[PDB]
Amino acid sequence: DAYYHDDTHEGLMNEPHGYLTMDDPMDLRPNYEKSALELLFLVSGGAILALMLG
Amino acid sequence: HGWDRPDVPLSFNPLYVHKRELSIFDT
Amino acid sequence: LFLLFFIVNLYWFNSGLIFFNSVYKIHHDAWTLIFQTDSILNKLKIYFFLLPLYISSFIHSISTWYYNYILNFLLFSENLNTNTNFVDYITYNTLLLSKFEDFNLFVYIKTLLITFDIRQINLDFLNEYPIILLTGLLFLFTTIFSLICLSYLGLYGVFILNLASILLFWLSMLYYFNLIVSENYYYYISLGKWMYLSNGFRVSFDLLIDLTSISFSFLTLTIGVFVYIYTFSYFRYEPLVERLILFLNSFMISMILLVSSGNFIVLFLGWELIGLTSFFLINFWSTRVGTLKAAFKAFSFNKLSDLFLFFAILIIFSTTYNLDILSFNNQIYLYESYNIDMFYWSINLIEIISFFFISCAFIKSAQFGAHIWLPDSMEAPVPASALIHSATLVSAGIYLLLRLSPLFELSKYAYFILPLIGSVTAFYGGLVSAFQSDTKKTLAYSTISHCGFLMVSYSTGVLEFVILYLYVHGFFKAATFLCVGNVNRFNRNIQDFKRMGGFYKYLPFECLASFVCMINLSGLPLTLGFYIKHLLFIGLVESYTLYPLIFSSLILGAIAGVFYSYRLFYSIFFDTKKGKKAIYLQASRIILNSKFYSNTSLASNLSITFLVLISYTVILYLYCTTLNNYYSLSDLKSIYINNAYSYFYKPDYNFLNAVSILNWFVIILLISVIYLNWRWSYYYTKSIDSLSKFILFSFFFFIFSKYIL
Amino acid sequence: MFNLNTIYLSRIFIEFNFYFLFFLFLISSIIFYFSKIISIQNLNQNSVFNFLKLANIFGILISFFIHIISFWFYCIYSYNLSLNIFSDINLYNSNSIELLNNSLLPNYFKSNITIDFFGLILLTLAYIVGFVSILALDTRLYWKNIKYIFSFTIFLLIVYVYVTVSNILLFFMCYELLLIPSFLIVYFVSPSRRAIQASLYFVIWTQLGSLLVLIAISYIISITNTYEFNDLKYFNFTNSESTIIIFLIFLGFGFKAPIWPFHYWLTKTHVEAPSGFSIYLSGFLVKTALYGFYKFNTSIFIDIDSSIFIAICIMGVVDSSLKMWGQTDLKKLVAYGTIQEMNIIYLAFCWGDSCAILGGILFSATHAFLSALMFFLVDCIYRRYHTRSLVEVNGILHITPNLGLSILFMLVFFSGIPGTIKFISEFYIFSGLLEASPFICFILMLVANVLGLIGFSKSWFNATFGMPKKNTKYLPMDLSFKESYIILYCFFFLFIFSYFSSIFF
Amino acid sequence: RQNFAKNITTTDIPKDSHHFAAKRSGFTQTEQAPFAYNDVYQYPKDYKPWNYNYKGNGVLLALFLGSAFSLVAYERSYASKTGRYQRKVQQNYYQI
Amino acid sequence: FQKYPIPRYLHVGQWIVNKNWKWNTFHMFFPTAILCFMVWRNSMISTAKPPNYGEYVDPQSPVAPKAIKY
């Protein structure tokens, strides 16, 4: 186009950013809700695989 | 080009102010 | 050291294997020398040069053993090896060289290497096993993963990944398109059992790649490729170009799934998917509730279509306990003499199913009454509108009619509703498009008119004409949509051409390509649109009770293409400068003069050019496959054969004179649009003089070319 | 190749899983009571409330895994047990396999365990919905009301007894035990001040239904002095008695279903109950009412026409669907969706024990998960934007993209997309109704799948899209990992349950 | 309200104590007192907040081993259901 | 449209460019191709095609459609 600013010189061409979730990366709590839900997901997947897949 | 334009104003999304009662008959 | 020792050991092992195999085969040295009778010199003889064979065997003695233990741990079987003590098993297996029978080290390596050769792919394998499924899955999963990974892939990453997937899909689909259209190929691909639907009944996710499916899918995929390449240009400096690209890809794959359905459940899945993806495409400007209302009107109409389709499928299942489309089509004739006791009425079984399918088709393929969502669906970006209007969303009803052709052959409701509604819709759409000042609304009403014409073509009983009309309309409507999208972007999001004019200089390629695509789209004489409209009028049945209204509407909608095509082209490009001064002056500054100067994108220009070229090639191929004296099209799976091809092959004089009446109506309309002076001009007198001399020249040219020489 | 080991595997797993849950609850209660004097939370890190939450959540999760294993054991056992009776054709031999009781633990309430597919589906729904609800109640349990962390374990134990006993009186009692914990949760855990009246309405409506069911079961017990369904099989009720029984059970379980016009309590409670209970109330307890109705009506021969009950259910569906457009409150809209789905499921049980209960069970599971997901989304919206009304929050997709995506995919799943299990349940019920009554089937599908869906999508699409211009200083953040994983698990179940074995469907 | 212990013992909080420097001289008669604690969190250099930073192989290995166990279990189940010890492989396999 | 600043905490895709998008494209295309190849093999196991040119179906062959023997 007429007057184009490339990505390197653009001041508002964002690189990927943002927090993926609301969990604090530097959170010091022994919070286990995420671990419990991950365990639920993994055990459900394994039960489907190890009991029902074939 | 030819002018250093400021950032897009907040007036581009004007805040709507409710001046009338939101009737339940117009739900 | 390591490499040299490995090479030496491999050579020794291969030599030992050759010695053993060349001495074991004929069952004389099979055992005698192998486990020779002690004689410790002999023992070292057999354990020293067959040592590479023995040592490896020792590994085979310990690798399998532990492996079996793993199974014993994982499966609770074999009671492990209590019969052995790990001192008899190891000695027995290590000293038993019968494992190395007819086995060579280098031959195994060669077989490993030749298991990935691509020179032996062969063409019969491609014919027998459709690779198009692999590329379609690649496109679908790349689209989904790009939707999930919008941060790993930036603008360029998303564009390149989806471009590669879509190009592989298009290249794969061209070969199978040729095979299916010409050489009577089709495939039924069962992707495993999908889900239970009745007690003991399980439907499977099946796909049917046949003539109807390949036609719709190839049209959709070509339009989608050349819109996707164009989409990146149209959304140049917009916040969510990756979002627009992924929405387009999702809508494309939804339509491909819809047209490739093998069951009514995959059909309903594709219907709902195209509905929701069109809703997301229309509601691209999520920050606007003004877009939300239009998208929600489209969503409501799609939900009504889903209700009708679901009820029709439920009636079919309650009648036949079957959901396979092929089985339903080939056995629905048995249930013609059937009725359903619905409330106080006894409705014919075919009549009610056809009513529901036809309502579902009419809502999607916009017909009169149910069309009102299509003009409001222009809030979507131009690439989205091009995909929606050229094919896909408005061609879904045509796909419903073509896929279930045997059902609608035996329906009195279809016989009465398809031609009447089609003609009314064609007339309405063409007439309204002839009066529209917005470019996108003009093309939307043109799409409505051509959908009505497609309904009429289906009512004629010839499915080849339906396919030809669908292809021509889709290709040229998509190209015209891209051209008007470039025009709208140049005009800075003002779509009405009352603020345009003089854009030929700023948009030369757009002007010329739009001219070509409009003369093809509007069915002007000597063009493919003229051919498809002539074919439509060839097969139009005259036994309808409302034939006067039907034929009058068809004529008035067929003559309406000239008006909207001329108005759009001339007002956009060659009218006076009705636009704003900022549009013209900013793009005409002397500093901008360069070899890079362009008000559009080189990628957009190349995409439109290649789209037009491929459209011409495909339409010519279809014409040669259908309209030639040697009919070479594949089976359309329809047993209702009328005599409409007789008037195409050996017409009578009355039909030629009627089509001549239509041609002269078109000529008079061209004369009107070209020479009528609605405004004062310095050329007004000279325009009348030009008209007079043109009339006289035409008369004398007719006189000389017919009689004198 | 089905041997005696699998039979005892299934029975032992069921009994000992009940005892696992009961022992965990007992140990947790003993620790909670004997470690503190007041038994309220000590507002510090070293508090038993952390241990109580850990113990209850882990009991629920591990007992759910054991329940998955026991459900698979039961599926194999039931398939092969129905096979064995069907298999042998010789008239001299019959299947006579007599089992022994376990030695370590007694039979609770001195009752032999009887397991059916509907009961174990109900138990699985109990486990999963209780897990989601308790995960949604951590922000509500605080100083002086932490004692309700055990409520879902109590529900699990009650329903475990409920779905495993062949005693009709124990069945009725376990159905009747679900009121006190529910009222205690609504009365003490709800933050809204209007939830006291909602709790009163819930109690009075559900207890009127319970009184009707009590009259019916009193008739059953007094007429035929027994407590076993086989003894019911060996007895016949006259036409008047059967009519009274079916009317009473239908009206009571429709008070709990709820059915038209007995859903006022459900609307008020759902609007005012805490989000965790709203997940549990709509997801599960109404399914217990469905299970009770199915067990009661199947065991009794009824000779009256069910057109009146079918009309009541269809009127409930229509009435709920037509009110979705006029709901600016997302939680009340989800409550009306729950009413519609519940009436549709209750319709499937109006043909006795025909091949219509299969769609009812599948739709019960599907509605459990869908209502859990929708109320969880409403909970996320109310915790983020501090409001639920459509006129106060919109443009969620632009500030909280994950929440907006979850809303959109929830709408897609709720629209009966063929890939999920709502489409399967709709297919079952609508095919049966179309063969029964085509015009009424079209009316039900038109009102539910078009008008109700249009209103439901209108109230959610307006929240998802727009501009969150006001209160930029107070705009919340995106979805956390807990909410994201709960939503993903709901989606995963709604998708993958379509591949469950078709033997029981 | 939250009542957990910020001063964890399992590890040391990654901190940057040089970003903010507390004032220690040149105070005026109306200035406020400086702040004692000025350490700020220091994220890893290769940390991306927009994705999962999971760089392990545990989940992949667990899923792969579960799938392999499913495969071998299905093989044994098919062998047993056909009345054999191991699957008998036909010389030719055709489309279903 | 004129570019405007985007919050750093917001995980949105507005004007997002990844400088390492080429390797991401590689590692998102090729494994997807492999997955689709495996699915393609699985679905090609269950695939039906009509007889080729010059081939007819023998009505008494097992391939021919069959009717139920009551």
Tokens (6 digits) for C257: 């799934």
Instruction: Please answer whether residues D468 and D396 qualify as being in contact, where contact means their C-beta atoms are separated by less than 8 angstroms.
Output: yes
SS3 C438: strand
Pairing, β C345-348 against β E15-16: unpaired
What b/e string do you get for F40-57 counting C-beta neighbours within 10 Å, with b at 16 or more?
beebbebbebeeeeeeee
Report how far residue E47's alpha carbon sits from residue E40's, in angstroms, rounded to the nearest whole number. Answer: 16
SS3 C576: coil
Report how far residue C315's alpha carbon sits from residue C313's, in angstroms, rounded to the nearest whole number. Answer: 5
Tokens (6 digits) for C405: 């052709």
Instruction: Please answer whether residues E52 and E43 qualify as being in contact, where contact means their C-beta atoms are separated by less than 8 angstroms.
Output: no
Interface membership of D44 toward E (CB under 8 Å): yes
What b/e string do you get for D188-225 counting C-beta neighbours within 10 Å, with b at 16 or more?
bbbeeeebeebbbbbbebbbbbbebbbbbbebbeeebe
Tokens (6 digits) for D292: 């009770």
F11–A17 C-beta distance less than 8 A:
yes
Instruction: Please answer whether residues C248 and C224 qualify as being in contact, where contact means their C-beta atoms are separated by less than 8 angstroms.
Output: yes
Tokens (6 digits) for C129: 């096993």
Tokens (6 digits) for C445: 């009403």
Cis peptide before D258 (omega within 30 of 0): yes
Containing H/E element for D11? helix D4-34
Report how far residue C630's alpha carbon sits from residue D134's, in angstroms, rounded to the nearest whole number. Answer: 73
What b/e string do you get for D493-504 counting C-beta neighbours within 10 Å, with b at 16 or more?
bbeebbbbebeb
Q: Give CA angle at D445 (D441, D450), nearest 5°.
A: 160
Instruction: Please answer whether residues D485 and A41 qualify as being in contact, where contact means their C-beta atoms are separated by less than 8 angstroms.
Output: yes
Report how far residue D278's alpha carbon sits from residue D195's, in angstroms, rounded to the nearest whole number. Answer: 12
Distance of CA F23 to the CA centre of its chain: 22
D44–E81 C-beta distance less than 8 A:
no
Q: Give CA angle at D366 (D363, D367), nearest 5°.
A: 85
Interface membership of D114 toward B (CB under 8 Å): no
Alpha-carbon distance values, C498 to C580, C675, C680 (Å): 10, 21, 18
SS3 E82: coil
C198, C292, C340 ranked by CB distance to D461: nearest: C292
- List, as residue ranges, the binding site of B for ADP: 16, 19-21
Distance of CA D105 to the CA centre of its chain: 29
Report how far residue C173's alpha carbon sits from residue C262's, in angstroms, rounded to the nearest whole number. Answer: 18
Tokens (6 digits) for A16: 């990927």
* Residue C103 neighbours by CB under 8 Å, 6+ apart: C17, C21
The residue type at A23: D
SS3 C204: strand
Instruction: Please answer whether residues C396 and C526 qualify as being in contact, where contact means their C-beta atoms are separated by less than 8 angstroms.
Output: no
For chain B, the straight-line distance linking the first and the last C-alpha, in angstroms and rounded, comes to 48
C190–E76 C-beta distance less than 8 A:
no
- Give the ranges where D109-238 is alpha helix by DSSP (H): 117-135, 151-162, 168-176, 179-189, 195-223, 229-233
Report how far residue C528's alpha carbon sits from residue C612's, in angstroms, rounded to the nearest whole number. Answer: 13
Strand partners, C263: C324
Report how far residue D249's alpha carbon sits from residue D254's, in angstroms, rounded to the nearest whole number. Answer: 8
A 10 A CB-CB count for C657 gives 9
**Positive or negative, the Cα torsion across D197, D199, D202, D203?**
negative
Containing H/E element for C128? helix C123-128
**DSSP line for D134-157:** HHTSTTT--TT-GGGGGHHHHHHH
Report how far residue D71's alpha carbon sits from residue D501's, in angstroms, rounded to the nearest whole number. Answer: 12
Q: Looking at chain C, after which residues does the C atom sit over 2.5 Å from the next written N, breaking the chain? A: none
- In angstroms and rounded to an integer, the radius of gyration of the C-alpha atoms of chain B is 18
Instruction: Please answer whether residues D494 and D412 qualify as being in contact, where contact means their C-beta atoms are separated by less than 8 angstroms.
Output: no
Strand partners, C341: C346
Instruction: Please answer whether residues D184 and D151 qualify as being in contact, where contact means their C-beta atoms are separated by less than 8 angstroms.
Output: yes
A 10 A CB-CB count for C516 gives 17
**DSSP line for D235-291:** ----HHHHHHHHHHHHHHHHHTTT-TT--HHHHHHHHHS-HHHHHHIIIIIHHHHHH
Instruction: Please answer whether residues D443 and D318 qualify as being in contact, where contact means their C-beta atoms are separated by less than 8 angstroms.
Output: yes
The residue type at D50: N
Closest CA to C21 of C93, C115, C88, C106: C106
Report how far residue D142's alpha carbon sits from residue D140's, in angstroms, rounded to the nearest whole number. Answer: 6
Strand partners, C204: C193
Instruction: Please answer whether residues C292 and D463 qualify as being in contact, where contact means their C-beta atoms are separated by less than 8 angstroms.
Output: no
Neighbours of E, requiring at least 3 CB pairs below 8 Å, are A, C, D, F
State the method. Answer: cryo-EM
Closest CA to C223 of C436, C434, C517: C517
Report how far residue C176's alpha carbon sits from residue C174's, in angstroms, rounded to the nearest whole number. Answer: 6
Instruction: Please answer whether residues D183 and D190 qualify as being in contact, where contact means their C-beta atoms are separated by less than 8 angstroms.
Output: no
How do the residues of chain B divide into helix, strand and coil, expressed in percent and rounded to 5?
20, 0, 80
Instruction: Please answer whether residues C393 and C254 qualify as being in contact, where contact means their C-beta atoms are separated by less than 8 angstroms.
Output: no
Neighbours of F, requiring at least 3 CB pairs below 8 Å, are A, B, C, D, E
Report how far residue C423's alpha carbon sits from residue C542's, in angstroms, rounded to the nearest whole number. Answer: 13
- Give the ranges where E46-95 is alpha helix by DSSP (H): 58-81
Report how far residue F33's alpha carbon sits from residue D429's, in angstroms, rounded to the nearest whole number. Answer: 40
Tokens (6 digits) for C431: 């007439």
Task: Report the helix count and the strand count for chain D, using DSSP H and E.
Answer: 21, 0
Strand partners, C348: C339
Interface of E with A in 6-45 (CB under 8 A): 6, 8, 13-14, 41, 43
Minimum CA–CA partner of E11 in chain A: A28
D72, D402, D480 ranked by CB distance to A51: nearest: D72
Cis peptide before C239 (omega within 30 of 0): no
Tokens (6 digits) for C658: 């009627």
CA count, 13 A, side-chain hemisphere, C455: 35
Tokens (6 digits) for C642: 């009328």
Residue C635: left (phi > 0), alpha (psi -120 to 50), or beta?
A: beta
Report how far residue D285's alpha carbon sits from residue D278's, in angstroms, rounded to the nearest whole number. Answer: 10
Q: What is the resolution of this structure in A?
A: 3.0
Instruction: Please answer whether residues C115 and C123 qualify as being in contact, where contact means their C-beta atoms are separated by less than 8 angstroms.
Output: no
Tokens (6 digits) for D322: 């037509």
Report how far residue C184's alpha carbon sits from residue C165's, in angstroms, rounded to the nearest whole number. Answer: 27
Q: Give CA angle at D267 (D261, D268), nearest 5°.
A: 115
Q: Which residue has the tokens 């259910």?
A: D313
A 10 A CB-CB count for D427 gives 27
Strand partners, E40: E16
Distance of CA D119 to the CA centre of its chain: 11
Q: Give CA angle at C225 (C219, C228), nearest 5°.
A: 130
Distance of CA C426 to the CA centre of its chain: 24
Minimum CA–CA partner of D61 in chain A: A40
The residue type at D234: Y
Report how far residue C491's alpha carbon sits from residue C706's, in angstroms, rounded to the nearest whole number. Answer: 49
Tokens (6 digits) for C672: 């009107």
Q: Which residues of F touch C187 (CB under 8 A)?
A: 47-49
Report how far residue D151's alpha carbon sits from residue D158's, in angstroms, rounded to the nearest whole number. Answer: 11
D326, D467, D470 ranked by CB distance to B27: nearest: D326
Alpha-carbon distance values, B12 to C493, C582, D151 (Å): 16, 21, 51
Interface membership of C651 toward A (CB under 8 Å): no
Instruction: Please answer whether residues F53 and C183 qualify as being in contact, where contact means their C-beta atoms are separated by less than 8 angstroms.
Output: yes
Q: Give CA angle at C633 (C632, C635), nearest 5°.
A: 125
Report how far residue C211's alpha carbon sits from residue C464's, in angstroms, rounded to the nearest whole number. Answer: 10
Distance of CA C5 to the CA centre of its chain: 59
C327-331: long-range contacts at Cβ-Cβ below 8 A with a sequence spacing of 24 or more? Answer: C328/C264, C328/C404, C328/C407, C329/C403, C329/C404, C329/C405, C329/C406, C329/C407, C329/C637, C330/C406
Minimum CA–CA partner of F5 in chain B: B7
Label residue D347 exposed, middle or buried (CB < 10 Å: 0-12, 13-18, 19+).
buried
Strand partners, C202: C196
Q: To 10 degrees, the CA torsion angle through D377, D383, D385, D387?
A: 80
Q: Give CA angle at A12 (A11, A16), nearest 5°.
A: 115
* Residue D99 neighbours by CB under 8 Å, 6+ apart: D7, D8, D11
Report how far residue D104's alpha carbon sits from residue D113's, in angstroms, rounded to the nearest whole number. Answer: 16
SS3 C193: strand
What b/e string do you get for A17-44 counting C-beta neighbours within 10 Å, with b at 16 or more?
bbbbbbbeeeeeeeeebeebbeebeebb
Minimum CA–CA partner of F14 in chain D: D398
Q: What is the DSSP letter of C707?
A: I
Distance of CA C595 to the CA centre of its chain: 37
Alpha-carbon distance values, C422 to C350, C367, C373, C507, C535 (Å): 21, 7, 17, 36, 15
Report how far residue C241's alpha carbon sits from residue C239's, in angstroms, rounded to the nearest whole number. Answer: 6
Nearest Cα of chain A lies from the Cα of E35 at a distance, in angstroms, of 22
Q: To 10 degrees, the CA torsion angle through D268, D273, D276, D279?
A: -10
Report how far residue C319's alpha carbon sits from residue C340's, in angstroms, rounded to the nearest whole number. Answer: 10
Alpha-carbon distance values, A27 to A22, A23, E19 (Å): 11, 7, 20
